[PDB]
Paper text:
The two genome segments code for four viral proteins, the nucleoprotein (NP), the glycoprotein-precursor, the small matrix protein Z and the large > 200 kDa L protein which harbors the viral RNA-dependent RNA polymerase. The L protein synthesizes two distinct RNA species: (i) the antigenomic and genomic RNA as products of genome replication and (ii) the shorter capped viral mRNAs during transcription. To initiate viral transcription, the L protein presumably uses a process called cap-snatching. It is assumed that the L protein cleaves host cell mRNAs downstream of the 5'-cap structure and uses this short capped RNA as a primer for viral mRNA synthesis. Here we present the crystal structures of the two terminal domains of the CASV L protein: the cap-snatching endonuclease in the N-terminus and the 326 C-terminal residues, which, by analogy to LASV, might play a role in transcription.
To further substantiate that L-Cterm domain 1 has no influence on the conformation of L-Cterm domain 2, we crystallized and solved the structure of the isolated domain 2. This structure was refined to a resolution of 1.8 Å. CASV L-Cterm domain 2 also crystallized as a dimer but—due to absence of domain 1—with a completely different and much smaller interface compared to CASV L-Cterm. The protein also appeared as a dimer in solution as shown by SAXS. Superimposition of the isolated Cterm domain 2 with its counterpart in the full CASV L-Cterm structure shows only small differences in the loop upstream of W1818 and no major rearrangement of potential cap-binding side chains, even though B-factors are relatively high around the putative cap-binding site. Co-crystallization of the domain with m7GpppG, m7GTP, GTP or ATP did not result in additional electron density. Again, we did not detect binding to m7GTP-agarose of the isolated CASV L-Cterm domain 2 nor a thermal stabilization of the protein by m7GTP. We detected a shift of the RNA with PB2, but not with L-Cterm domain 2. As neither a monomeric form of CASV L-Cterm (deltaC) nor a dimeric form with a different dimer interface (domain 2) binds m7GTP, we conclude that the dimerization of the protein and the presence of domain 1 are not responsible for the lack of cap-binding activity.
Author numbering: 1800 to 1892
Write the structure that this text describes.
Amino acid sequence: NLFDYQFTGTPEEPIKGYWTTTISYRDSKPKISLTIRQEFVEGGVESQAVLATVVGRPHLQDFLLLKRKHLEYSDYPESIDLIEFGDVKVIEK
């Protein structure tokens, strides 16, 4: 495949109540990655997204593409599907 993947923690073994997954464009430097942090709340899972990227990129489209890969890789895609671009923290290196 064409993406790099990592995770730290899981829903069954969260790290201080959180777990995170990161998916990135292979060989990106400065790195293009989307990190999704999840935690249990009453009735479901709450997701927060950070797009680490670079000045000039089409952040919306990068976000949408990495979001689709997160949907296939996460354990609670319904919670990630709710994230809209306006909610994403964008860090341009």
